[PDB]
Amino acid sequence: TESLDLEFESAYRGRPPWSIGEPQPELAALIVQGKFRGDVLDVGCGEAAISLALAERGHTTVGLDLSPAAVELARHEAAKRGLANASFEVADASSFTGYDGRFDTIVDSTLFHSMPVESREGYLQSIVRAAAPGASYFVLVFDRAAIPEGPINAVTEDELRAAVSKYWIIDEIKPARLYARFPAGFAGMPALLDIREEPNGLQSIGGWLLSAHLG
Ligand SMILES: Nc1ncnc2c1ncn2[C@@H]1O[C@H](CSCC[C@H](N)C(=O)O)[C@@H](O)[C@H]1O
Ligand SMILES: O=c1[nH]cc(O)c2ccccc12
Ligand code: NA
Ligand code: NA
Ligand code: NA
């Protein structure tokens, strides 16, 4: 068995490197292409920068996270922005109900590798249950070539395709960057991970961007 529940709750209570204060750039590029339609589910939402950006762009949004501290943070930023159309709830992405056929777009911003491999089927069944016909699904996930076997369940391209294609029609899988703001000396000196330094004091690690739709 494995569980990261306590770690995520502690990180949110205190800032997490992944809470970059904006949607992940790879996902913001899909938003500007018009790929996010209707009601949006931000699954494993964390502080929910992408929900909040979509709720500013006319969408009704729902963010789900297993961490109560993440949900508090997302609600607190929605309050600062006066955003009545963004809502958040504590829920397990691998086993949630209450949204049958609701969402036209479901976005997984780095939740995928944050649950055990054995929870993926339940998670994929749960988001399909919450999806309206023809819904789009976008996943940003770490690459197993960058993140090893351990607490994080990063994926190879073939592994990701095999898991998701059982439930969705895949349109594209391509290499992507996952951005973060890491502390100085993160993962050692020399570093044990390949962390790319980016402009604006950000960093990135290799991943995959998957685009799919309900068949
Ligand atoms: N089973 C599960 N159900 C729901 N959320 C989960 C979960 N397992 C992990 N999470 C959440 O998945 C998130 C991964 S970190 C990414 C958070 C956010 N999407 C962003 O891009 O900033 C965490 O907030 C963690 O609490
Ligand atoms: O899941 C993660 N754990 C710890 C990190 O610092 C991190 C940084 C970026 C993205 C994801 C993660
Ligand atoms: Na939009
Ligand atoms: Na988890
Ligand atoms: Na690219």
Swiss-Prot record:
Instruction: Write the record's keywords in alphabetical order, separated by commas.
Output: Cytoplasm, Methyltransferase, S-adenosyl-L-methionine, Transferase
Instruction: Kindly summarize what the UniProt induction comment says about this protein's expression.
Output: Repressed by the transcriptional repressor Rv2887. Induced by salicylate, during iron deprivation (at RNA level), by anaerobiosis and by superoxide generating naphthoquinones such as menadione and plumbagin and by pro-oxidant phenoxyisobutyrates (fibrates) such as gemfibrozil (at protein level). Part of the Rv0560c-Rv0559c operon. Operon induction is slow but is maintained for at least 2 weeks in aerobic culture in the presence of salicylate.
Give the EC number(s) listed in the UniProt record: 2.1.1.374
What happens when the protein's gene is inactivated? Deletion of the gene has no effect on growth in medium containing salicylate or on intra-macrophage replication. Deletion does not affect sensitivity to plumbagin, menadione, nigericin, PAS or CCCP.
Give the molecular function GO annotations. methyltransferase activity
Subcellular localization(s) per the UniProt record: Cytoplasm
Q: Name one Pfam family in it.
A: Methyltransf_25
**Is S-adenosyl-L-methionine given among the entry's keywords?**
yes
Q: Which reaction does it catalyse?
A: 2-heptyl-1-hydroxy-4(1H)-quinolinone + S-adenosyl-L-methionine = 2-heptyl-1-methoxy-4(1H)-quinolinone + S-adenosyl-L-homocysteine + H(+); 3-bromo-2-heptyl-1-hydroxy-4(1H)-quinolinone + S-adenosyl-L-methionine = 3-bromo-2-heptyl-1-methoxy-4(1H)-quinolinone + S-adenosyl-L-homocysteine + H(+); 3-methyl-1-oxo-2-[3-oxo-3-(pyrrolidin-1-yl)propyl]-1,5-dihydrobenzo[4,5]imidazo[1,2-a]pyridine-4-carbonitrile + S-adenosyl-L-methionine = 3,5-dimethyl-1-oxo-2-[3-oxo-3-(pyrrolidin-1-yl)propyl]-1,5-dihydrobenzo[4,5]imidazo[1,2-a]pyridine-4-carbonitrile + S-adenosyl-L-homocysteine + H(+)
Query: Which is a Gene Ontology cellular component entry for this protein?
Result: cytosol
Please give the InterPro entries that the UniProt record associates with this protein: Methyltransf_25, SAM-dependent_MTases_sf
| Gene Ontology biological process terms, A to Z | cellular response to iron ion starvation; methylation; response to hypoxia; response to salicylic acid
Q: Does the keyword Transcription regulation apply?
A: no
Q: Which domain of life is it from?
A: Bacteria
Instruction: Relate the assembly described in the record.
Output: Monomer.
Q: Which family does it belong to?
A: Belongs to the methyltransferase superfamily.
**Further facts:** Is dispensable under in vitro conditions in both axenic and macrophage culture.
Q: What does this protein do?
A: Involved in cellular response to chemical stress and may contribute to resistance toward antimicrobial natural compounds as well as drugs. Catalyzes the methylation and detoxification of the P.aeruginosa toxin 2-heptyl-1-hydroxy-4(1H)-quinolinone (HQNO) to 2-heptyl-1-methoxy-4(1H)-quinolinone (HMOQ). Can also methylate 3-bromo-2-heptyl-1-hydroxy-4(1H)-quinolinone, and shows much lower activity with 1-hydroxyquinolin-4(1H)-one, quercetin, 4-hydroxyquinolin-2(1H)-one (DHQ) and 4-hydroxyisoquinolin-1(2H)-one.
Record's protein name: 2-heptyl-1-hydroxyquinolin-4(1H)-one methyltransferase
